[PDB]
Amino acid sequence: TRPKISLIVAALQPSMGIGAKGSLPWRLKNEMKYFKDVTSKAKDGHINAVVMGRKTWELIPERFRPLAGRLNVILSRKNDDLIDSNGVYHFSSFDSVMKHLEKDSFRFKDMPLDKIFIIGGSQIYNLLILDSRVDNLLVTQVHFVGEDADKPQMDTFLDWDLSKWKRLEHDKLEQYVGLDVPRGLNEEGSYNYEYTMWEKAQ
């Protein structure tokens, strides 16, 4: 995997709810912008991939899709590993798409891939945390500071193992994503959140 693989996710402290049934009980305005800047930022002449599940794809409004400036990869169990004329990859598994990219030297429309972001929620976050090809986690740590009755009843939890990841210094996050990042906590109505990066083992 010549490109770096990132798994980018917003978890809720300290329990780590990934979704409440499937909606995300927060509109974090500056989170959306962070996500756009991070996934689009590549070297000159390079491009990034965005990898997501069928259901995340359908949640994006027609307006904004395919996610512009990125290789868009959609994973569904029974996809047939097809590429449509717009360059969107319709694949059945992450391993299937890594194989196909590897045969083309990790290039998309003759551009080198730089970073691959798994964004895909639900489903594939927990299917893919376990894959050792994953180089790092980009975790938006979220804190609820509202009014009790506003507290999210989180349904699905990031199958993370505290033992496997070490948090990186902010400079390393900024180097990696290639952009200055607001540091410390970010307060947005009923929520506090901060951007973090984790890599594995020794």
Numbering used by the authors: 2 to 203
Show me the paper's own sentences about this structure.
Dihydrofolate reductase (DHFR) is a key and essential enzyme in the folate pathway that converts dihydrofolate (DHF) to tetrahydrofolate (THF). This coenzyme is required for a variety of cellular processes, including the synthesis of purine involved in nucleic acid and amino-acid biosynthesis. The active site is located in a cleft formed by α-helix 1, α-helix 2, α-helix 4 and β-sheet 1, similar to CglDHFR and CalDHFR. As classified in E. coli DHFR, CauDHFR could also be designated to have two subdomains: the nucleotide subdomain, in which the NADPH sits, and the substrate-binding subdomain, which is predominantly formed by α-helix 1, α-helix 2 and β-sheet 1.
The structure of apo CauDHFR was determined by molecular replacement using the structure of CalDHFR as a model, while the structures of the CauDHFR–NADPH, CauDHFR–NADPH–PYR and CauDHFR–NADPH–CYG complexes were also solved by molecular replacement using the structure of apo CauDHFR as a model. Crystals of apo and holo CauDHFR have a single protomer in the asymmetric unit, while the ternary complexes CauDHFR–NADPH–PYR and CauDHFR–NADPH–CYG contained two protein molecules which are independent and do not form a quaternary structure, according to the PISA server. Analysis of the NADPH binding sites of the four obtained structures shows that the holoenzyme and the CauDHFR–NADPH–PYR and CauDHFR–NADPH–CYG ternary complexes have the side chains of the NADPH binding site residues in similar conformations, whereas the apoenzyme has more significant differences. This could be caused by the conformational freedom imposed by the lack of cofactor. The substrate-binding regions of apo and holo CauDHFR are largely similar, with the addition of NADPH not making a substantial difference to most residue orientations. The main difference observed is movement of Leu25, with a change of 5 Å between the isopropyl functional groups. Minor movements are also seen in Met33, Thr57, Leu60 and Phe65.
